Amino acid sequence: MTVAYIAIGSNLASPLEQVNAALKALGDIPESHILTVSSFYRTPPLGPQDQPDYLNAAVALETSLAPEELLNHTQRIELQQGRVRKAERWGPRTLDLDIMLFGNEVINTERLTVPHYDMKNRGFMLWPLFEIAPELVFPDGEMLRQILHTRAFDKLNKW
Ligand SMILES: Nc1ncnc2c1ncn2[C@@H]1O[C@H](COP(=O)(O)CP(=O)(O)OP(=O)(O)O)[C@@H](O)[C@H]1O
Ligand SMILES: Cc1ccc(C(=O)CSc2nc3nc(N)[nH]c(=O)c3[nH]2)cc1
Ligand SMILES: [Ca+2]
Numbered sequence: 001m002t003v004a005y006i007a008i009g010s011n012l013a014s015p016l017e018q019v020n021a022a023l024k025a026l027g028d029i030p031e032s033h034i035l036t037v038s039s040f041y042r043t044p045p046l047g048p049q050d051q052p053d054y055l056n057a058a059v060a061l062e063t064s065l066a067p068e069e070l071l072n073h074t075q076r077i078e079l080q081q082g083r084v085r086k087a088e089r090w091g092p093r094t095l096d097l098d099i100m101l102f103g104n105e106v107i108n109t110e111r112l113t114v115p116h117y118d119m120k121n122r123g124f125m126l127w128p129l130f131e132i133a134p135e136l137v138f139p140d141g142e143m144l145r146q147i148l149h150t151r152a153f154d155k156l157n158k159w
């Protein structure tokens, strides 16, 4: 088994309902078990700001799936919860499931890049991650606690 850490975001179609449904669906992923769920946070949008605030959270999922097989499931869940692709970059969505980390693995395939390319620059990813995994060390040896101690991020407000 490996522990994967998944970021959850939603800012459309009742984010609390979307995230609760997503958590049930994550539980139903085969060869996998949810270990920990963060608090839910209400976060101002990064990127385009003309969209509603996000519900953000993080989940620890123990799994024996291959990383791309996990991605298959997370994409399926997003699509089954009505995620629609529009033209605008970084627009609102019913559900976003980003694979932040897959154990200590570094993955670079056509479909999957892990660690998530920008997670170390996003408070809405790092704070919920720290809530569920305060001892976390990244594949490059960087400590989550040290990033959050050193770098300026706004505090997150709970939903
Ligand atoms: N770690 C990861 N988790 C989830 N998807 C990933 C990924 N690495 C690459 N991808 C790929 O990312 C593609 C596009 O995903 P999108 O959800 O549209 C980007 P986003 O989440 O809105 O922005 P962001 O990546 O800046 O957070 C997916 O089709 C998937 O193949
Ligand atoms: C500079 C920059 C930084 C981050 C981002 C993104 O996170 C991609 S789109 C997005 N914006 C978001 N804002 C918040 N608060 N939460 C998200 O899940 C979320 N997803 C886009 C641009
Ligand atoms: Ca399961």
Ligand SMILES: [Ca+2]
Binding pocket: 009, 096, 098
């Ligand atoms: Ca994202």
Ligand SMILES: [Ca+2]
Binding pocket: 096, 097, 098
């Ligand atoms: Ca995504």
Ligand SMILES: [Cl-]
Binding pocket: 064, 065, 066, 069
């Ligand atoms: Cl697999």
